[PDB]
């Protein structure tokens, strides 16, 4: 039509359109008006310079007001001019910096001074929470923001249909040197080297695995092989188990497993020209495996005899209670006298329960 | 950790077409926005386009709708910048960023940047 201050005929689309008051103005008239007011009278003087129609006197329409022609002045005036409005902002309404928001799905920035934990973006009219920045549904109200984010990540289809390869990997793996972590499953080669350290260790107990004749521990007999020292309990160890013995020593515990899923598709990092590249694990996926392949099954397993701090000693006839002696106790067990097999297993046990704990360093949950 | 790596950038005379992508991973990349932004040689930063997580919705400044077009392979974990009718005024180092939940920020991650030039 034209503009409402000087009355110069333009298209409406060259002109801005108060949203307080719909009034059409000239950017020479808006910019002119409102840079003057900021730079020569107080914030409630900046109302429209056609109507002043924005009842600027009450502190009720006031911070809305304000927040809504905060995105007209951004665009309009000059940079200075522009921050000496959220000086007197901060000054005389707010007495602190006013709350400024991004939203997450469109990238808009914009003053949010309301009540609600939910804000509606004026650029791409979407609602989000205020504190999570997610998007607003109704099951979000009356719950915290974890539980809305967990409701979410348990009934997106596409991680559900992961299955357990994302149990694994949430299992991450902790460089004991560094301190990096992997969003990686400890797969089926225990012996892993970190990045930033270059530090060796052992994905299942995190002990070290040692350079030649760099090993300290007493009476070790391949100090002169790179290899690392692993306690019992260790997934080093406990692969070798039958999926069925492992499942023993859970059941024995009342501590429940998956056998279905609730090729393989456990993510690994394959060496490429430029860089890692996540290939899925991709082996055969067994019946009563639970969608993963026997050695990451096995590891699923692993892990929740790890979380319970089960003993797999427990399960151990006399010849392993012989070597588990030799190897942790570093001496060559013998029977005594008036010993039947059962009395003599039982002092193995007790002696090694005693004397020699579980992984200290495993990761137990 | 998240990575985001451009490529595509190059010379082209005024008029000409150029097609940028940004490989991601390190995060779930379908649940995040994704955008573009540009610094001009001397300027600041510049933003261009930003995508929704499906693509549902994209968005984009009005020296460049129109002209530039913002899409996304969720199954390739990658994002594009299909620009035609390149002019002078796009000459600048392009960065893929994506998008954020955290407080205080619309991004919280951006690429190392593909030069642009524009004869």
């Known amino acids: 039509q034209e503009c409402a201050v000087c009355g110069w005929a333009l298209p409406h689309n060259r002109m801005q359109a108060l949203t307080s008051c719909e009034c059409t103005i000239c950017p020479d008239c808006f910019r002119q008006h409102f840079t003057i007011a900021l730079k020569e009278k107080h914030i409630t003087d900046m109302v429209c310079p056609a109507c002043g129609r924005p009842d600027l006197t009450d502190d009720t329409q006031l911070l809305s007001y304000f927040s809504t022609l905060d995105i007209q002045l951004r665009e309009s005036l000059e940079p200075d001019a522009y921050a000496l409005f959220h000086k007197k902002l901060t000054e005389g309404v707010l007495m602190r910096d006013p709350k400024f928001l991004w939203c997450a799905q469109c990238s808009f920035g914009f003053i949010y001074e309301r009540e609600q934990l939910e804000a509606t973006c004026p650029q791409c009219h979407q609602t989000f929470c205020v504190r999570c920045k997610r998007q607003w549904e109704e099951q979000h109200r009356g719950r915290s923001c974890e539980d809305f984010q967990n409701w979410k990540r348990m009934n997106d289809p596409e991680y559900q249909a992961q299955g357990l390869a994302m149990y694994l990997q949430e299992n991450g793996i902790d460089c004991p040197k560094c301190k990096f972590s992997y969003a990686l499953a400890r797969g089926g080669c225990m012996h892993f080297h970190c990045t930033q350290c270059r530090h060796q260790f052992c994905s299942g107990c995190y002990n070290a695995f040692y350079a030649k004749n760099k090993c300290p521990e007493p009476n070790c007999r391949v100090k002169k092989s790179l290899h690392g020292h692993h306690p019992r309990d260790c997934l080093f160890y406990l692969r070798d188990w039958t999926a069925l013995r492992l499942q023993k020593l859970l059941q024995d515990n009342n501590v429940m497993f998956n056998t279905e899923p609730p090729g393989c598709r456990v993510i690994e990092q394959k060496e490429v020209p430029n860089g890692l590249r996540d290939e899925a694990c991709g082996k055969e996926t067994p019946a009563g495996y639970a969608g993963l392949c026997q050695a990451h099954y096995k590891e699923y397993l692993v892990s929740l005899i790890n979380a319970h701090s089960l003993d797999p000693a427990t399960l151990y006839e006399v010849e392993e209670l012989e070597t588990a002696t030799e190897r942790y106790l570093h001496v060559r067990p013998q029977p005594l006298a008036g010993e039947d097999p059962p009395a003599y297993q039982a002092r193995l046990l007790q002696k090694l329960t005693e004397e020699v704990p579980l992984g200290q360093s495993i990761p137990r949950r | 950790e998240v990575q985001l790596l451009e490529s595509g950038g190059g010379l082209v005379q005024p008029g000409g077409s150029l097609r940028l992508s940004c490989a991601a991973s390190?995060?779930?990349?379908?649940?995040?926005?994704m955008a573009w932004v540009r610094q001009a040689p001397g300027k600041g930063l510049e933003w261009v386009s930003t995508?929704?997580?499906?693509?549902?919705?994209?968005y984009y400044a009005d020296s460049v709708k129109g002209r530039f077009t913002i899409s996304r392979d969720n199954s390739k974990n990658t994002l594009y910048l299909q620009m035609n009718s390149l002019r002078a005024e796009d000459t600048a180092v392009y960065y893929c960023?994506?998008?954020?939940?955290?407080?205080?920020?619309?991004?919280?991650?951006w690429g190392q940047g593909t030069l642009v030039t524009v004869s």
């Open positions: 390190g995060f779930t990349f379908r649940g995040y926005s």
């Open positions: 960023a994506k998008g954020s939940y955290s407080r205080g920020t619309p991004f919280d991650y």
């Open positions: 995508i929704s997580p499906i693509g549902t919705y994209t």
